[PDB]
Structure formats: structure tokens, C-alpha cells
Amino acid sequence: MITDSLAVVLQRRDWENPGVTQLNRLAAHPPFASWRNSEEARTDRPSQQLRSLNGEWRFAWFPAPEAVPESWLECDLPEADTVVVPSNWQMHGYDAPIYTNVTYPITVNPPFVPTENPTGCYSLTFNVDESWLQEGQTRIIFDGVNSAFHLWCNGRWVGYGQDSRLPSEFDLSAFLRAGENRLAVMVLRWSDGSYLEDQDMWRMSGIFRDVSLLHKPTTQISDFHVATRFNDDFSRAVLEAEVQMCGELRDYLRVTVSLWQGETQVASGTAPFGGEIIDERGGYADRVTLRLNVENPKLWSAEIPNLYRAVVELHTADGTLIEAEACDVGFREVRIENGLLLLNGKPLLIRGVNRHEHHPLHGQVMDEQTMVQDILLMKQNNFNAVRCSHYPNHPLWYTLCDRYGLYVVDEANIETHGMVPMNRLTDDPRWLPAMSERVTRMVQRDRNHPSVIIWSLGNESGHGANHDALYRWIKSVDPSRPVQYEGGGADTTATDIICPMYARVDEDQPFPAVPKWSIKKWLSLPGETRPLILCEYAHAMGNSLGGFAKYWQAFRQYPRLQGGFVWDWVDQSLIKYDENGNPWSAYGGDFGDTPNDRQFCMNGLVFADRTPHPALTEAKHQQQFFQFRLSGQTIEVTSEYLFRHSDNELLHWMVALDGKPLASGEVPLDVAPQGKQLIELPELPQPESAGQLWLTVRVVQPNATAWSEAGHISAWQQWRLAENLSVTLPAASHAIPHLTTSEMDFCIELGNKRWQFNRQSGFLSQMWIGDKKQLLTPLRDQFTRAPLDNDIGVSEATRIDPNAWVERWKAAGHYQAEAALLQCTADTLADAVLITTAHAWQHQGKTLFISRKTYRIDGSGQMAITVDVEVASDTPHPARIGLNCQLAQVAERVNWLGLGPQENYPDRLTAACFDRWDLPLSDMYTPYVFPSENGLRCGTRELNYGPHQWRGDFQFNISRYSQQQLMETSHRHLLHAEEGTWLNIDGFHMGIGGDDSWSPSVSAEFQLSAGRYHYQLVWCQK
Amino acid sequence: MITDSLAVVLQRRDWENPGVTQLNRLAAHPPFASWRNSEEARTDRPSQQLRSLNGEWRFAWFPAPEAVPESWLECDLPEADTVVVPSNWQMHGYDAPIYTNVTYPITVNPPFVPTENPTGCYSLTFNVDESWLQEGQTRIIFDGVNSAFHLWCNGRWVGYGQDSRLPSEFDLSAFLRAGENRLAVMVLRWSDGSYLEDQDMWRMSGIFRDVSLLHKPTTQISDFHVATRFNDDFSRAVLEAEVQMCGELRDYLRVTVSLWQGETQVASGTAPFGGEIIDERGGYADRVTLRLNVENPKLWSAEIPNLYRAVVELHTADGTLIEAEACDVGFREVRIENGLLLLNGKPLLIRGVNRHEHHPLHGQVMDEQTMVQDILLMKQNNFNAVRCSHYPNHPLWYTLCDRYGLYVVDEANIETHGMVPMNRLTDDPRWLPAMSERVTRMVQRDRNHPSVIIWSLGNESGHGANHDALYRWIKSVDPSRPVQYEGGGADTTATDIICPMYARVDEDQPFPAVPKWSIKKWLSLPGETRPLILCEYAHAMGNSLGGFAKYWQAFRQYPRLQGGFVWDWVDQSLIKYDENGNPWSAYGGDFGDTPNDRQFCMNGLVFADRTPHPALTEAKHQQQFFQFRLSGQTIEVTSEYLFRHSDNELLHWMVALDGKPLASGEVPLDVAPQGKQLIELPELPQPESAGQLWLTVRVVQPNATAWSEAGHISAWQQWRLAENLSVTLPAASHAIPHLTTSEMDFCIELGNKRWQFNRQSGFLSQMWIGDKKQLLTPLRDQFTRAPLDNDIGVSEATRIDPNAWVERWKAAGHYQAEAALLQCTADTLADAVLITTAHAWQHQGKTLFISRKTYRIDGSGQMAITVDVEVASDTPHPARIGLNCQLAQVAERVNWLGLGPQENYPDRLTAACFDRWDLPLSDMYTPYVFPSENGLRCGTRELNYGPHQWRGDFQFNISRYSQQQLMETSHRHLLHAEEGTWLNIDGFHMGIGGDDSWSPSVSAEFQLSAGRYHYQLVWCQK
């Protein structure tokens, strides 16, 4: 009673002692349901022995654990509110969530936490059945409680837990009473284990996972391990099932291991308890092993996820069933040989993506629906693997990955990024136990899931001897799954697969003592033989993911480059409400946190509500399982599938002349795994009309898969066919334009058409049709764009990074350059009026750009603008070379002939196809929450907007928001639509990068460094 | 106050929780003295900052920890006695010590200990200086406290410790007060960590090691690591010294690492704090590394232990010294290449011996004098290595080994022999932290000692993944020292050196799943490349250590067989007092323990009082560093030294004819390391007198070494030179014997001489000279001996082992065979009287042995006895074939010409030399505490005892105790001298074994299995 009081518990600061990480906590095991019937376990029916405690709980908040009154042990306080479980109290409003990347959210002082420790007091009052108390053992399972937590049952102290992403089990057989039962959980936000929880997420705390109650008999199945051994041709399989019990040893106890495929029983085995002799003292008397022979097993893979149901029944000699535990087993073997990772004897090509557990509305509380939607999006966007992102995930996630066929790289909850140096805790043996608790238990939890193929020690923890010891422990316990570790440059002895972060394809970044070579050179280093799979690459932070084509070309060309994991899947945004209560996404810094990072949480390929980014189309196109090669008139189709045959795919081809279709057809696909097929196209019609012939092929799945709908497109490709150049001549313009030369203006009139050039500025001041003005602002040049997330880097107002693109642009005066008029002349021709303008942009007496324009008004109404731009070599390369204007008329449709229909950039245009796309103006603006340059469409041959038509080769972006507004504003909900419509037509555009979000990632081939540029535009009224 | 009470502490059973192994305990480090002066640290002067708390303490004993009153926290109880510290309370009489080998001393139930937990309450009241409280940190160091212990300072709880053989340090800066300070230590005999302390010793408990108090400044030298890197010729050395501090970081702090050889400074280095960049966050700001260049360093080895003094001085920029820490560094490099362990580029030949920390009087409390005496005995008996025997030893032991030059194999305190199976705790990750605490700290304690060359994970713990993880951790932290592990058969991945236990030279013992092949076949197994060094071999249990010559021949012949460790050095006997108080040695079972083993603790090469066994001479002879080969007249001397030159050795040769010297000389030895020398002997005198010429060479050290006296002999050898057979004839016997044939007797009279044969028994009933009887019992046959410790094995009264030699002997009726007379005839010759006797030994109607004897009385007085013995093939081989008698006269001198002067056996006669030895009768009996057969001398050509002289080739043993008394009695102090003197002359003797003490270890070449034997004896009066 006295020892169960708060004073005794809080005197021993278990949240500040690295030696003490658990108290009265049961050992980890694969998930159990305690089925009392074999048929219920085989069909995965819900078990009445498994009770869910999720629901309405009583919550109280305190600024310090010592501020909690002791009367909370006896009864709930009247001021306590009613919340839901699982839920995080930071989302409710009790505490402000804090986001951080490198620095710790608390003062670094291991193993001491600050005194102001936020404390959550959870209470639940329920009723238990009397049959649960007469016999058996009743335990409580917390699937996850953030940081440390103390448990009380009926006013008596039960145990203490420290891990956040691993289940904690406590025995309540001697604590539960018959009738009313009230528990009391005291959760602390910061503990000593939070020094190992420095992951890239929002730091929330509380019971964010399910709380369950399990009842077992007096004799239990404490653990069971399953493994599969194959031969060279994978025709005979040996399933080894080792079962460990706990409790009294009796001679009549038997274990039956049954394997089922659907409803058909495949193999079975019944043996009495007692194992083989291992040591001089004998063998285990409480473990029994079973060897089941399977003839021609259906192998498991991400393409075909064949699953078997394994039921372990502990019963008596007479056949009376005591307990039954079921699991899903997939027959597969991952092994590294000759420096190659082989699954079922075939080289894997990982198309994975980093995935953070982030609910759109509930924060870190993950449910089945969001998980299923994420899996469907991954599989539809050509992803076959998923990384757990530096912590263990929901146990249901692995089951769903087994069901849908996704490779899983399970990660431990170890991260010491804030420590200086990074191995400060990972080399100290005093922290060796705690890290092991965050590893070994996880190894014991998900070793029976065929989706899990690679174990991970951690990330951004440096390299310590503890990491080597844990790597050796995992390799000794589970040799079936190769493991990896990023820390130490990923060339250390703690890894079997070279897994660097953001290693570029060709350019090297030789950091001191931790260099990041190119992957091609990394494979060619002396003494290196392990395969290379990128744990983190292609940082997609907002408008990003450039150079993905180079990455996948390097992956496909090199046999030992087996792909990588895109970082990351889902944006980490928190919803917030304004003074109307309108919902809007928010990033770090919007919750009143002083030690926070900016929008660096807002990386991913989808939004918070699983809305796909334009980069997801690029990711889908670059990860296609079908490669196409057009030779002459035939098409070579090469499948990248390793285990499945092309039985649910057909090829659909279409030939188009400048967006107008001419011929089409459907050819079924019959391709062997990693095979070749030849498709002979029929006679392709080639008209004499001017234009370019484009051939587009797509792969359509006719039937509905478990993860895709009917008519889903999995791959596509486009080629340029024969071109017929336009050699016809325009008709002679009977009407001639009339030019009036004012003192300050040049006005050209052609019937309805009218133009007015301002002689003081040298730009096209106004356009007129009838009596309606068409320009709110003059058509000027634009050598700057809104800075992207990759351009800013890690540069803030208080910290200036000289290597960032935006800092070099503003340092050279690109955003502050004022145009100075040099020449502005006008003269009439025989059938046209020529306007010659020449300007120069200067900053502090230094000329940066010189623009010379020639305007030609034809008698047919066309405006021919030829622009020549000279850029200084010493100045930083401009991000844009082209024009800028604000039209005075808004339109509801935009019809452009060019590459689309998605947002594409010079380094991200492979996914876009050349066609005629008619889209609403609302879809022209990509709703990035952090405002930046967006909506650009490259390869545009024609652009129709309202009464205006632009022709030529250019990159256009059209939106309701100016570039200066996108520069000034920091949130998308604060953006307001301006009058008219802003249009930016650029002759040349500069890349976006995407290798990393802290260094210049744009390759030299996509930089505007030629020096002299020229582009021609034709503006007419349609 | 309330939390400091006993109720709060004992509510949390920290001795029953594997997760909690330490509370408020400082990190491990190399030993510190906190010198405030550089000259004091260089000369290793005692430091006044280091206080010793050893002395008189107040002790109380309680049967349970819950029985301790709380008033013990405030003041000592009046009923508490005054004991010494360090000391074990089992020796005082509070508790009975228990010895056990395999089974646990408690009921096996991890991690629960029995409720009846013996508890010792220690208290010390002292005074501290005020200057220690104004500044700096004061800590208390327990060098060793057995099992768990709780600490209180001035009534306030300080910490909790669990390890027994490793130091535990607690901070007392906030607990100590000015003036009187009283501490309170509560020590528990059994804890959860005792499951890892199942070593082969007496289970004592209490504070058995030193208690010390250390004072450090506010800025400390927390740790320092030293390492040496060499080139291929070991001419240039790089000493790397890494220093870690604790406390405030200041810019003026400097570290000076100075190296001294005697008084001469060799190298120095001063650098500011700050290390190299290691990770992306930078490097350590509190560690500084120093690289010192040494030109032509004096390498350290067991032959020449060259030592340097390394002084690390933390001071300021102006030169004000803050702290100084000194250590001993030896320049050496142990590395395994090509499957060979090389020290300084030379293949080591380990001559080690297992050594248990066992004081002759104080139990486990070890002091400097006993350690120095043990080291001197080891070095004088040709031992160059010593194993820590399954636990860390005194920190002074490693320093003394560095000073005297002994290789040390440091072992961790891990042993789970009683667990079924043996890896039950070593594969469970829940016990992974605790084992790491018993490893990593030890790695941090003795990594700066050049004597330590091999780390050890443990012994008899099976094989678990925790062992692999710990092996990888040690290999990552300290790659300079190769490690080994016995568990799992010593072919597992957790070892680098194959170290089996009691692996025989040629015969295999294929145990299931843990086979013990022969070492020669073990080296030749497929896929095996690691060298083989026996961790335990040649079990010397009492009369043992047979076949050592075969072991060392195998070691010398095979390059990859690099020797082994004899088991063990010192007997584990406890002194006890009888009702006179006379001291006598006692083994397990004499302290009222029901779960105990018998004298299996009483193994070793020396007694409790360091009295050498006769097997120590064999160990010394078989481990000589000089090998001799006699060819013709010259002698080849080959040195086995690897680094030293023969500068303190001279060869002394002597030629003897039947024990009478003829020529001698001294030749100095000038032999290179592993070199060859040729000694040409002068003209050896060969007289025509009958006899055998023996050449004996010895190696004598003239000067006094630090471990040997002047005139010490290190090696010796003997050879048989040319033999002159006796062809002369005995003189004609003028007097003839007179024979009287009685009905029941045959009486032969020859002047003074008289003999009487009993016709009913057929044996020599009596001998007479004058009127004095010479035989108390008739001279009969003896086919049995007292069973040795190797013959009994693990067989007791309640457990019968059918493979034990003694059980086969008593099952066949060897000890119960009754002699049946077959023939007894007498007849006079021309000058002699012939007596022909023939007997037969039977048991249950089955004849075992048949003896036929011929007695001849010559007129000169000689008795010629020719004995022929026939032994059945199916019966077990007898241990002895020869005669037995009890003379009626005791004598004070025994003069025998034969092999001696030590106790030698047919498999242990290599150390004995053939000469004439005159020794007292008291030295004829080896004082083995467990009575067995002893005192046998083989190769005896003549034996003079009183008026009797025996001639021939025989093995004799003479003592005051009969063989039946040695069989019946179980202690040496209960033995009583019988009337007369018992003499056993045997024509043939059977081996003793010694490979192990639980299986028949005698080779087939030393077994009496010929079937027919013959021997001749000549008995006369001199």
C-alpha cells in the first residue's frame, strides 16, 4: 500500500536510469489470440478470449509527474475529461506537438530529462468475467505507449514500461478482482529512452496504439518459430516449427502443427514434447520441433503472394484441445550470394518507399482503413517494398503486407541523431541493454511474417560496438533474413547490404570520415562485394523528385544496384483550424515551438489525405515492370517480373498526329518472367499534313486484382515517329497594320486588333480586342522563379547558407534587378510592323542579363516575338528565361498541345506524354501547402486560353497567384486569387533537383549555363 | 527517509529481477589512484587521495533479508560482532560453506531465489577530511562483494550491486557528512546473478575483496586506453593513448602523456582536447588522442617482461597539474595469422595452468604474499601462462603478472552449468544485459594490462546468441587480443581458438551433438583453420597426471597445437579443527551440506599450503624450455625460448655406474632463441665392472633471477649409456641349508638365517634372524590396489558407474578373491632348497588369477622367488601384479637404486631419474588428504630397508598404512600408523590415467592385459 503509493514509485526515477528499462514485463512473442477451437483459428475468426480495451477512457493532464495527486490511485478525479483510446493528447489540445529533425526537443543531458515532464493520467473502469479468474492467466497488452509509463491495477503497482513502438505485456492474474476493475496508467512524455527516439516525426506522446486483454490456460504456448528450407529448384520444402510452452510439464501433452492452403490440408505433424540433445546436460524439455514436408509449394512473392495457414494446437493425448495459435506462413527464401540479394533464386529489384505512420486526422494512431488505402496506392503506383522508417509498425501492417504482397524492411526504434558525436550512446555499454530491448523483442515479434525480409538496426546512430553486437545477435538468431545498417557510411561490419542515404548517381560528396561516393563508384571500391540498396534516396520535398530517371537507369544497368527506397511516402502535416474553423494543413513552427524545424516534415509523394502529388506519376513511370523498345515498326516488350507470367495484361497502341488520333489497336501480352516479346505493328498511316507523329503504348489490366480496378494502367511509353515539316507559305496579308508613333507610346491598329507599346519601359503595355483590355500588367521578362523547397535548402533568416540557390540568386540581385531601357524602335514594313526592343537588367552597377526582343505584327493578326537573352558567366545561373504577364480575363478551361497532363519539369518530364490536354484552371495550380513554383508544363507546342493562342516551343505555367505572392506567402491557405490570370511562358527553364533538400542537387545538364538563349513565340486570337 | 527504509527497498526484489543489475553505479574504468603529483605517479608511490577501508567492521547475520530490523540503518545492533574486512562470514562460522560442481546449491527456478536467503549486515564508522567535502567527488569502490548487496550512507540509500568479481563504484559526494560517517552494507548470499556464478568452487559470500575510498577533482580523467602498433620487424612503435574526461569543458585543459623506461623519459606528447571527426555531427569534444613514437622498443614477453611507465597528466595551459594517472604498458602484439597465434611474430607454446583464487586460511580473500608465492612457484615449475578460471581476479594479480612475465587469459564471471540445457539463460535475450555487465565492464578494467592476452566469454554455458553478440562486441572494441570460448564444443563462431576440455591425444569420445575428438583429428577436420589451445586438460585429481608426456609430444610435434592449461593449480580444501583443535584439510561434505560433491574440489598440483605434489615434478619436466638429444657422444641442445638468449644457464653433465659417479663437468650454454647448440663430451670412462652407465644432464642458472634462486635447475635429461652385463659366477656355497618337513610347516635353517613356510596357506609364514621375527603377516600376492581418484570416477554409494575401474574390480571379486592352495612341495638340491607353490584366486566359482611361485634358498643366504601369474582375459585387468607383506621392524632410512626421488608411475616416470636415493620413511608416503595408492617407485633395481635387501626389476611402495586402511579411510587425519611397516613389491603395475576424473583415462599400453606375467625377486640380509 505504502510502496504502491506515488512517493515510492517516483523516488526511483526509472525514466532517468538506463539500466532499468522494464519491470514485471512479460517476454515478447509473436501475436497471440488464444483460440480454443481449431476451426476458428484456421479461419482467423475473432477470439472471445481476446478482449479489446479501446474506447472511452478518463484522462487528466499534469505538468510534472510529482504534481499528480495520490487520490488518483483510488478514484478518478472529477476534473478529468473523457477521451478516446488509442489517441494522442497533443492532438486534443493538452500539449503542443513539437517537430524536430536534428536537435533534440529537450536539453541534451543523458540520462536526465527536464523536470517539467508532461504527464498523462489514463483511467479505465471495466468488468471482467468470473471464468477468467477461476483458471488461467490474464495479461494486459499495450501495443504501444510513447516513452515511459507506470501501471496500477486496483491501486496496486503492476509494472513499468519504456519502449514506445513495441508491445508491453503485464500479468494481471494476481491483481484483477471479480466485478469492477479500475486501472491507472501514468504516461510520461520524456524519458531516458527518448534519447533513442530521435526519429524524423512529430514528437507526440500517450497511448497511441491498441490496448488489449488476453486470457490463457494454466498451460500455454509461450512461443512458436516457423522456418522454410528449400532445395535448388524449390520443389520440395521442409517447414520447421519449433514450439516453446510455459507451465507444468506433463507426459500427455501433444503438439499438432497443421498446414492449410485455403481449405485443403497440405501437411501435418504430431510429436510429444522433448527436443534433440544440444549440450552436455541434454536438450530442452519444453520445446518440440516439427518437420513438415511440402511437395511443390506455392512460393510467396510481391507479385504472387501465396500464403499458407499454420495452426499449432497444444492438446492432450486423448484429443482434448487445450489451446490453438494460428499464423500465416509464406514459402520464400532471401539469401545474399555472389554479392546479390536473391529471393527464390531470382535477383530482386527493390522499388521501395519510406513510410511514416501518420494518420490524416488522428496523428500517429493508425487504423486498418488508412493502411489498406496506403497499400493500394503503393501497389497501384508500382511499389513492391516498404520500409518501416526507423521504428516497428502495427502488427496488422505486416499481416496486410503478407496478404497484398509487399516486401517489408523492419526497423528498430534506435536513433541518436542529436547526440554529438552520433555514436555517443551507441558505443557506451551502459546503453547496450536498452538498445537490445528495442531490437531483440522486435526480432521475436515479426520473425514469422514472410513480408519482413530485411532487419534494420537503426538509422543515424553513428557506428558503435553495440551495433556490431546486435547485428551479430540478429544474424545468429535469424540467418534467413539478411540485415542492414546505415550508420557509419554503410561500409561497416554491422551491415550486409550497402545502404547509404541520398547517394548520387555520378557526382561524389567526400565528407570527412563519412564520404558519400556515387553508387557506381561505391560498387567498384576495392574489397567491396556486398550489394547496394539505397535506404534513403530521391528526397521528394514539395516540388522535387528530379533525376529519378538517372537513378533507375543506374539501377537497371548495374546488376548489383538493386533499387532503393524513396523518401518518403506521406507528408507529415497536422490539420489546424482558423477563426472560421476552416481546416488547413500546418507544419513545424505553427504550434508555438521554439526548438523546431520548418516544413522539412512535409516530404512525400502523397498529401495528408492521400492525394497524389505530380511526382507520384514520375515514380510510377520510372518503376514500371515492363520495358519497351521501338525498332523500325516492331516493339520489344521486356517484362521485369521475376515469378509471374503476363496473363492479366494487354498492350494498347495509338498513333496520333499533333494530338489527333489516326490508328489504334489492342494486342494481348504473353511474356514469360524476365522474358521478351515482339509485337509487329500494322501499317501506320502517315498523312502528308504537317505535324509530328507520336506513338503511345500502354499496358492495361482487364480483370480486377485485389489491389487494382478494371482498366488499370501499369506501364506506358511514347516515341516520336516520322515528321512532316511544314513547307507551305502563309497567305498574303491583304490588310496592313497601321502604326501611330506617339511621344511615349507606339500604337498598332489592325481592324479589331490593337496593341500599345510603352516607349518609356519598352514592353507591350496593352492589348485590345474591341473595347476590352487584355493585360493588367505589361508583358515583361522574368529571370526569377518562386524558390522551391530544394532551392532554399537549410537556409533560414537567422542562418544563411551560401551554397543554397536562393541565397546566390538574392545575393547577385536577381530578385532585385531593375530593367533599364536601351533601345525601342518601330518601323513599318511592306506588309508588317516591326518593333525592336532591347533592355538590360542591372544590380549595383553590374549587368546580369541583356534581353533583345523583336515584335512583328502581321496583317493576318499574328504577333511574332523573337527574344535573345545574354547571361553573364560569373553570375549564378538563372532559374528561368522567358516572359511573364497577367491577363485581364479568367477562363475555366485550358487547352494545350504538349507534354502532360501532369506537372512536369526539364528533369521530371519522362512520365508526361505528348498529347492534347484540356484541363480546368483549378488543376493548373498544384496545391503545395508551402508555396513555390508549380504548374509548369514542358514541351508545349500550343496553348489555348480563352481568346488567346500561343504557339512555339516553350514551358508555360498559368495560375491565379503571382510569383511574388508565392514568394512572400508561407501557407497555401493564406494565398488569395488575384485579378485576371497570371501566365509565365519561359523559353528555357532550370531544373528542380531532388537528390537532397540541403545541397544543390541539380545536375549540370539541367542548369541554364549556355550563356546565349533564343526563343520564338506566336501570339494570336483564336 | 520513508523510501530509504527497509520496506521500500525490499519490496522491489532487485535480487530476483534480471533486468535490474545495478543502481546508481559508476561506470567501469582502469584502476585509478588520483595522483596529484607526476613524480609520485611515475614511481607508483601510495596516494593520499586513495584511502583503504579494510579493517575492523561490525557484522550481524540474519536468516532472511526481511528479518533485518530497521534500527540497523540508524545505529549498529549491540549483538553485532567485530569481524575483519575483507573476509567471508562462512569461514567465521555464521554459515556453512557449500561445495558443488554441476547441480546448483539452490532450487533451480530462474530468476527466483529461495526465501531463506542468508543476509550479512556490515557496518563501518569512520571519519572523513573536510578538504574532501569542499571540492571534488568522493566515491566508494567495492573490489568485490559476493552476489547482491545494498548500500546505505548515513541512513540514506545509495545504490545496489550484483556482480561478485568486478568492482562496484558509488558516488558519496552528496551523502558523506563532515565528521562521523557510518555506512551500512546488506549482502545477500543468493541472487538472480548466482545463476551465472556456477563455477567449480566453494560458494562463499560476503565482502571478500578490498573496500576503498577515492577522491577526485571536479574535473576528472574518466578513462584512458593505451594501444601499441608495430611494423614487420618491431623496430618502430606507435603508442596510441586515448583519454576521456568527465566534467566541465574548458579551453585551457591539456593532457600530457609521458612514457618512462626506469628513470629515462622515452617519448612525450601534449595536445589540447578535441578528437578527429568520426560522424556527420563531428567528433568527441571530451576525448583526446596522443600518438607517441618509440624507436627500438623493448618488447614484452613472459621470458623478458620489459615494462614502461605511462603517465597521463591532466593539467592547465600554465602548467598547473590537476590530476595524474599512471599505468604499466608493455610493447607486445598477439595476432592470429595462418591459423597460428603469434606474439611479436613468434608462435607461442602455452604452458598454462588453471588457477583458482583460494587462500590457505582466509578462503577466497587473496593477498599479495600468496599471489607472489604462487607466481614464483609457477615460474620455477616452468609455467608461462595462467588462466583466470571463469572469473576476473584481483587487479593486483594482473600487475604482478606484468612484473613477473606471465600470460593471462582473462575470463568473465559467466557459468550456467546447472541449467538444463546449458544455454537456457545464454540464449534468452532477457538475460542478455546481465551477462554483458559481467563482460563489458571487465573489458574496460583490464584492457591496459599487457599480461592479459586472451579474453574469455565464460565456461560451461552452452552456446547462445548472447555469447556470439558478446564475442563480436569484444572483437570490435579490442581487436588486439584474440578471444576464445569453450561452449558448444569450441567449434562455434563465438571463438577464435579451439579450446576443448580434456580432449585426449588419440582416442575419440563422440558425445551426441558435442563430440570431443582427438586434438590431432580436431586440427584435421574439414573447414577448420583456427589453432587449438586446450583450456582444460590433464585433470590432476590426487594421484593423477598420467599421459602428460603424450600431450606434450603432440604439442611439440604439431605446429598448430600450441599447448594448453593444466587443471588446476591449487587444491580447494578448507581447514578444520578436531576435538584437540588439530588442523586438518577437509573437502565437500564435511560442512553438513546435503547438495554437495565429494573431494572433486581437491584437484591441483600443490596443496593448500603450497606444498608441491609429486605431479608437479612431471609438469616441470614436460614443460622444459630446453630439449636434449644424445647422438653418439655429442649432445644437441635446442632452446624453446622465443625472445631471450641463453645467458644465465650452464649445462652440467654426470656419468654414473649404478649410482656411483665416475666423471662430471660443466659446459656453459650459448643458444640462440629457438636455436641449436652442440656439446661434445670428453672421453667417458667405461669400467669393466658389471652395471649400467647412465648419463644425466641438467641446466643450472648461476645468477639469481627475480623469480628463482641461485642454483635453480630448469631442465634435465637422462640417457642409458653402454651396459656391461654380469657374467661372473657366484662362489660355491660351502654351507648347505637344512630343511625340516613338519606336518603343517616347512622350516629351513641356514646358521643365523631361518625361514618357515605354512603348508596350509602355501605362503612364507615367517622369517627369523637370531631370535627376532621379521614378518607380522605372510608374504602373499596382491592383485588389487587402493582405488585412486581417477579409478573411482563419479561413482558413489547411491550411484554406481559401471565403467569405473573400481566398480569393475569389485564386481568381478578382485577385492574379495580368496586364495586357494593347489600345490605346495619342498625338496633339497645339491646346494639349495627348492619350494614350489601354486595357488589360485577364485570368486563365486570363477578363477581370476593363478599364481605359481618358486622359492630357492641358497647356501649364501639369498632367497630367489620366481613368480608366474596367469590372468583371465574376460576378467577386468588387474591394477597390480606382485607381492605384499608387513615387516615387523620399522626403519628411519630407505635406500633404493632406481627411478626417483619423486613418486613415479608407469605413465608418469619421465621426470624421475635413475640414481641411488636415500630418503626417510616419512617421505615414502605422499600425504594425499583423500587416501589412495601412493608412494610407488618404478624402475627400482635395488631396495635396502633396515637389514633387508631386495634385488631385481620391480615397482615398490613402502608405508606405515596398509592398502585396506587406505581403502576404508576417507581422510588423511584419521589414518593411523600400523605395527611394523607395510611393503608392496609388484612385478607389474597398471596406469593411473589423468585425462579426466569421470571416465577411464588409462591408455591400452599401460593396462595389464598381456595375460601371462613373470618376475624375479632376490631377498637377502645386508
Curated annotation (Swiss-Prot), chains A, B:
Belongs to the glycosyl hydrolase 2 family. The gene is lacZ. The active site is at E460, E536. Keywords: Glycosidase, Hydrolase, Magnesium, Manganese, Metal-binding, Sodium. The keyword Disulfide bond does not apply. Changing E796 to A/L: The catalytic efficiency is not increased, when the sodium concentration increases. Pfam families: Bgal_small_N, Glyco_hydro_2, Glyco_hydro_2_C, Glyco_hydro_2_N, LacZ_4. It comes from the Bacteria. The keyword Magnesium applies. Substrate binds at N101, D200, E460, E536, Y537, A538, H539, N603, W998. It is an enzyme of class 3 (hydrolase). Inhibited by phenylethyl thio-beta-D-galactoside (PETG), isopropyl thio-beta-D-galactoside (IPTG), L-ribose, D-galactonolactone, lactose and 2-amino-D-galactose. Binds 2 magnesium ions per monomer. Can also use manganese. Binds 1 sodium ion per monomer. Mg(2+) 1 binds at E415, H417, E460. This is Beta-galactosidase. GO terms for biological process: lactose catabolic process. Changing E536Q: 10000-fold decrease in the beta-galactosidase activity. SMART domains: Bgal_small_N. Changing W998 to F/G/L/T: Decreases affinity for substrate. GO terms for cellular component: beta-galactosidase complex.
